[PDB]
Amino acid sequence: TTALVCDNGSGLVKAGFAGDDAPRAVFPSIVGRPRHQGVMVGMGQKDSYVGDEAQSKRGILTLKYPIEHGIITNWDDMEKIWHHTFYNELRVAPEEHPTLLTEAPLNPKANREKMTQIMFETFNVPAMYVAIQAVLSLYASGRTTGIVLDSGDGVTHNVPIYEGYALPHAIMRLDLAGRDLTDYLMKILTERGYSFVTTAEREIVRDIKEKLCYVALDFENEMATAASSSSLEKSYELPDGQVITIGNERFRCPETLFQPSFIGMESAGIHETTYNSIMKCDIDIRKDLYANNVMSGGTTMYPGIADRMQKEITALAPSTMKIKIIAPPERKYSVWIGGSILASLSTFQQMWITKQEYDEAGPSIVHRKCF
Amino acid sequence: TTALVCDNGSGLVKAGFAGDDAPRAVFPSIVGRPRHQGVMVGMGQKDSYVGDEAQSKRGILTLKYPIEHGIITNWDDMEKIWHHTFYNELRVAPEEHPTLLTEAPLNPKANREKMTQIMFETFNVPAMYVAIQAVLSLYASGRTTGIVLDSGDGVTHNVPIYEGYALPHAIMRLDLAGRDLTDYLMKILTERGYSFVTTAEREIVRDIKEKLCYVALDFENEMATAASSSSLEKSYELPDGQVITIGNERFRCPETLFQPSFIGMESAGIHETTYNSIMKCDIDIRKDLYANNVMSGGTTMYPGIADRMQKEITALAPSTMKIKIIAPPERKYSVWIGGSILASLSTFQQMWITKQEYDEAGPSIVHRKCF
Amino acid sequence: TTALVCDNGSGLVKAGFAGDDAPRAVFPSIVGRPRHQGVMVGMGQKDSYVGDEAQSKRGILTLKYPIEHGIITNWDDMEKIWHHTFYNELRVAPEEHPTLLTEAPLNPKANREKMTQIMFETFNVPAMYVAIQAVLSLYASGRTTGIVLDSGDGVTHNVPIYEGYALPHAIMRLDLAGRDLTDYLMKILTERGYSFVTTAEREIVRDIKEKLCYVALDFENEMATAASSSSLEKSYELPDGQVITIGNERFRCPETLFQPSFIGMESAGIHETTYNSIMKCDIDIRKDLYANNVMSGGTTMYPGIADRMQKEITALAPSTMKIKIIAPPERKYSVWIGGSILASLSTFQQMWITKQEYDEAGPSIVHRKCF
Amino acid sequence: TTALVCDNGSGLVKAGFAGDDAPRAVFPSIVGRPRHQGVMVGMGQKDSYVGDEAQSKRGILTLKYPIEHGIITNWDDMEKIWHHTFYNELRVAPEEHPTLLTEAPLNPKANREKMTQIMFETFNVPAMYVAIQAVLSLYASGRTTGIVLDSGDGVTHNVPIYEGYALPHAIMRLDLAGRDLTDYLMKILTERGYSFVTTAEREIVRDIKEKLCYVALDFENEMATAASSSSLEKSYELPDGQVITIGNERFRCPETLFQPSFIGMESAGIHETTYNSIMKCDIDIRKDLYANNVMSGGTTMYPGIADRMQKEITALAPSTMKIKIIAPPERKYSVWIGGSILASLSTFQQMWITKQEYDEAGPSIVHRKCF
Amino acid sequence: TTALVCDNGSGLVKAGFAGDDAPRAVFPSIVGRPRHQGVMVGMGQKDSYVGDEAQSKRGILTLKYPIEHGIITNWDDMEKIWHHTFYNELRVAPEEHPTLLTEAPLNPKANREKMTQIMFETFNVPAMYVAIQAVLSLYASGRTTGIVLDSGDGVTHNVPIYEGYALPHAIMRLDLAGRDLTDYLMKILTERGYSFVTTAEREIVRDIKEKLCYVALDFENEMATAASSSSLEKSYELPDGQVITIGNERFRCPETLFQPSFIGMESAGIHETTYNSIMKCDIDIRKDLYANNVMSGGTTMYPGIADRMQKEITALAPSTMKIKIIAPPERKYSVWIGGSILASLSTFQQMWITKQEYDEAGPSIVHRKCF
């Protein structure tokens, strides 16, 4: 039997089974659809490529993401990704065991409801449960208390947990994430003189970002340093041999998380939203939350981001508040890892929503009871 | 049943059937019409000679090419060539099976349309399909991806294909070909002191070119070498015994492909047009295209042209771009060969345009649907 | 004193002075360089012709554009154009007064920086200021709020302004413009059977486009109309007497602005990019932006393009959004006109970058402070 | 019915019918008119003797040739010869069947025109056709391609034929023939000491020439041989018993064909004119012409003339040109023989010019249409 | 000092000095060599007569032309002509000043090279320059743009010039000229019945041609007119009193320029070659070329040839092409005149090839640098 864990995030989908130590199936949430005219006969083609298929044909296909802002849009294509996932990446038929899904808290309930329908109609799984991503991150860390700053490709959200429970009113979901960082980077690459404009290039730039970008500890002085030094200039060989070289842009990009106004974003900097969430919590627990600032999600994989985060929070907080940030190796996958744990974690058997219950009450009961 | 493949190029027409390994009928696209007065009775003459007939009477007849610049002009004479082809070279009546025709992409649609009419009215073939020459070249090579540099007697064209499809906007057709090389050679033969002026001589010179001309790897220094050496001086015995000897002209002629300005041509050198076509392609695939520079057409049969081509492209491209040129023996006929394949290639049965469909919709539907 | 306004766009350079009502110097951004061998002595020639000189010798000289994609490439030749401009078209020496330059937002900063150097070293102007083209367009219209859809020869860009300010993050620069339309037209003229291939012909075709092309309101049905009517067939007498006649191509050409995929372009149609820019703006102002869709640039001079634009945007927008497009006579020059205004507009004296400041801080300060 | 063939050459007239293998009527083109006073009554005389009549009375009559240089002069006497021919030699009245006449190409059209009148007014033949002598020579040889070197009593002409047609511009008529050879011989016989001065003697000398003269292969050394040897001295018994003996003169006479300057002739040697005619032909066919040097006419009946001709041409031509001369037994009559063939040759019925057509259009139409 | 201009054309050599308004030395390019045996002692003879010497002894000497087809053959005799020219016609020793030579473009470079040697070794001139004949024709006309149709005794060539430069690839040299017209005329004079066969007669016929021949405007109808009218019959008194009368031949002769096939020539008519040359030029300039059809060379001195030329070209060209032919009085000498100008034309001093440079680099540098 066992169970299947599916970290259906944007950008990357991470799948593996209960009790596994690593999301064996890591591939991109991309569907590619033939950008050009079909000359040549017996091409072996199909009007849909997914994951690494789309990657191999990155500059041939129009690449689309089925979801955006943590919201599922192209339901058909999303479904197709799951189909591929289960049958080609995992190679297991739904009915063999229940599936653990996940979502970022505070998102249009239609997502949860429609996924439920799909799971119990397209796939017809034994049972299903959708869990909040942040919560799973703590399960991976093995903590019952802390602040979860979960920031990935899709969205960023901040959850406060304290011996379980979680405090709804202090949960904040910020529409600022990896995709925005990517787009911003392209814009400033134009300033330098590298016209990256295509989606194929958005994807290429994603890699560029991942390889070179880092977080400044003192943005202002490091900017000033860059203005008088070539030491930060790093080269990157594009697919076609076009080596490009990137300077201050290399940290100006991730800096936008701390100064959102750079992309026209109204809200406060990421560290300020963290702080504010903590401010919404009772002073009886604020101290413990300060000592457990769990960071996760792919956008926390920048060099020095934790150090910068500590610095920033320390400045915002009062003296004696021992700001302790938790950001271990492989935190990038902590949500999926937590899922592996929770799914295998005995007691959880009573939480699964059975197909029977779906057939009885329907979608809405999941909306009501599953968290 | 089977099917007939007809490589209706300029200069040479290559015909044979589906599944054949060699265009059994190779003969020139020439119609000869009595240049002189008809004295002598019972001469056994007719006012039209084609192919090898025209060749045997090369200096008696006015020799004309029905097509030029890949465009069909003298429709009547072109038709006559096809008539001869089918009935004397192939010795098969149209209705026995469908015919695969071919054309260079980006040419006045009237060609396609009027050929269609002829095929289904003069010949009344079962079904017909006109395919792009470049595409067929890859079929012969067995590739689904690559750059096709197809340069023959008629025109030169560069097509970029990538797992089929082909990228229209990067297809470039260059009005520079074998006939221009021939004419240029005659002009510089005059410089030497060999007044070649006649069409009979154009044809003779064509052979001369084919026998002696080669591509310099370093034109400048090889020119300088020629200026101080008789080693490149080669003799050629003309039909009437007039042996002629040719020096630097021997490579100055084919050099014009790389420096078109030599004949007053505005456009960039052949390697530059290749490069530019690749530049119009997405950087996601440029690398693969660089590794699959398929050369074909009769004008690529020059000694060292591939080596020169590699050198040139390598200089234009950035480091790491492993410029790999594909130019096998018999590439001269790769288009016809590809036709043999495609015609026999099962699936292609669904592409044939039937006479019924012609009768229903007419010419324009072929223009619209057949590629 | 006064001041000089220089609309240094691609294709056409428009110059005149502050307070003028018409760019007295309108001439093409072309440098011509002798395509052929120099026989004949005392020809009165020089190895560089510009503007109307290049036009008069259009088929003798190799015609090149110093800039492309809004980016300055051949700095030397660009400089030469400015030299000619100031001394022969305007007949005024730099030091007499400051010069207002202009650029399309979001372009490799090296342009701005190097122009700055030239202005204060080759010309040594009193003071200089580079302004965003879109902004100047509104100055001409006399508006403080609106969407500027500026689409000329060089590039197309969409800027959102609202009581001044402008919203950076919603500014989009599209690499699709007049030159692409021209090239596309040539390609489809080949389909018809008019082998336009030369740069001289690119220029001739530019005129052809300007004279005959128009924007369909219902492309599909107008295409269908063309397929059964000669009413759209219009004749054009080429320089050498060759009258040509153009059919559906006449609107298929400009249609590519609305369906970019026709030239292999990844991005969405021009109206969709307009819409999207507005979507990036706050809903508090979107309505006003919808009511002020200012169109400018030479590519908006097509018959019915505004009507088509309205139709398209109206479809994209929700009900009640009174899509109001602003596209007055002479909008083709609105940028230069705006420059005339702004330069004369008192307050602007505090914005000029003085040569002193250049000498003090250098290029980079202009990059930093001038917009 | 059948038809009559009349080889109206100078010197000898050869007549016979279509399909005959030998010109049954061979007699000289001479009219004799009483050189002396008429004493004796009942002499049985008439003031005109022709052919063998003139021969029998050779030293009594003033002997005149009606034509000279291939041109008809004494029309009356020429007519009289034809009268005699038809009625005494052939013994057939004109109206019984059509008559094939012949002429050397490139001669004053008045000949053709006036003969036409005579044929359809004096004789009133059913139909008539005048054919080029050279062409008929090939008909006798059964060739469709070759050089015809036709050299008789009248004139010498060189025609190039290639699968029929014939190439006008390379046809050369040389005013050097048997009569000139005869006269020259008389002049050098005087050098020896044999005062031959009369026309009767011109005729006698003609025989002498025919009996003894031969062509040297190496004139210079054979001359030198003669200068030290009596082996070439040959005796000839004149009518009155006067035996004469001839030495070097025996080959000096025919040598003049190769060195025309000997008689004050401007033009090049016979072999050079042959060569030159071939040079006027396209190099595509020159080789075949070299391999088909058909010689005919009475002046080619000299011993070793073909061998000398080959030697000479071989020297003029380049290596590999297999000079092949065609000069069969009875080539002396090849023109008449060809006539016999052509006249009997079915198809030729469509070429005959009918008396009706003569009566309709008149002389000029023959000039225009008959060749 | 000054300079000497030598129009070394075939047929006539025209010499005079820089700045002169008329080639003071006009005499024929003929060398005469004693056709006959030298009896008489103290004859005052020499074995070489040139120019008017050869003319006075026209029927005594074998007359030869040192050059043919614009190619120098008998170098020795050509040299002798120049010797005579300089010392007897001009009466000036080489070293006094530089000499301007001329040639028709597109001729065996050996001519240029060997002349160079002679000029700087036989004559040892200060400096020398060989210029293209067509170019000089425009200098005489005072034009910087036009088509030069230069047709003389030697050859015919068509050059396209446009504000100097000249377009190599559109230059066409036609091997059809005055000498061919002369020979053809002789051939058709034979048709009439005037056996002109000698070189002395070729020369006489040249005069006949010059005096009577004219160009038909409607050859067909004028031929028909001649066929029914004696109005075109003109008489010419030959040297020996033999008056001859010429009819239709009078215009049939020059007609061959428009219908080359009359002499077995493959190529198109003179007006067609003009047209074709223009077709090879860019459409940007074709119109101006149409408006500047400069005609020169002795063969353009026929009555109505310009009118016929206009008619013909007008038919070939499209409407609106204002075919303007330029053919002034004395255009026969325009090349020499142009030479007079260019040689005196200041700047040209920098073009002269000095004897020093010859001694330094040798012949080949002239081939390379002088045009």
Ligand SMILES: Nc1ncnc2c1ncn2[C@@H]1O[C@H](COP(=O)(O)OP(=O)(O)O)[C@@H](O)[C@H]1O
């Ligand atoms: N090693 C890395 N360095 C920098 N950025 C990264 C790295 N790995 C992933 N990212 C960014 O984080 C995002 C993917 O993280 P992930 O948490 O899987 O997103 P999601 O949870 O929405 O799937 C992408 O936008 C990616 O570019």
Ligand SMILES: Nc1ncnc2c1ncn2[C@@H]1O[C@H](COP(=O)(O)OP(=O)(O)O)[C@@H](O)[C@H]1O
């Ligand atoms: N072996 C060869 N060497 C050099 N040139 C060749 C050779 N074979 C053909 N060519 C040239 O290539 C042309 C014929 O090639 P082909 O591809 O059949 O032309 P097309 O495709 O237009 O029929 C001719 O111009 C010919 O002179």
Ligand SMILES: Nc1ncnc2c1ncn2[C@@H]1O[C@H](COP(=O)(O)OP(=O)(O)O)[C@@H](O)[C@H]1O
């Ligand atoms: N009247 C017109 N009709 C159609 N197209 C035009 C017209 N005028 C200009 N264009 C096109 O617009 C471009 C020139 O406009 P302009 O705005 O001056 O460009 P830029 O701003 O880059 O100088 C050219 O590509 C031109 O062909």
Ligand SMILES: Nc1ncnc2c1ncn2[C@@H]1O[C@H](COP(=O)(O)OP(=O)(O)O)[C@@H](O)[C@H]1O
């Ligand atoms: N057997 C011969 N040997 C030498 N010369 C001959 C012989 N037969 C004929 N001839 C010469 O050739 C001429 C006759 O040949 P023929 O071809 O009949 O002349 P035509 O064609 O003008 O009638 C005469 O001048 C004659 O002397």
Ligand SMILES: Nc1ncnc2c1ncn2[C@@H]1O[C@H](COP(=O)(O)OP(=O)(O)O)[C@@H](O)[C@H]1O
């Ligand atoms: N007045 C004339 N009328 C007709 N033909 C002429 C006249 N003058 C010269 N020609 C012909 O033109 C030729 C001479 O012209 P020219 O241009 O001097 O020749 P080239 O340039 O080769 O010296 C000769 O063949 C001559 O017969």
Ligand SMILES: [Mg+2]
């Ligand atoms: Mg996540």
Ligand SMILES: [Mg+2]
């Ligand atoms: Mg081909």
Ligand SMILES: [Mg+2]
């Ligand atoms: Mg603009």
Ligand SMILES: [Mg+2]
């Ligand atoms: Mg004969």
Ligand SMILES: [Mg+2]
């Ligand atoms: Mg001349």
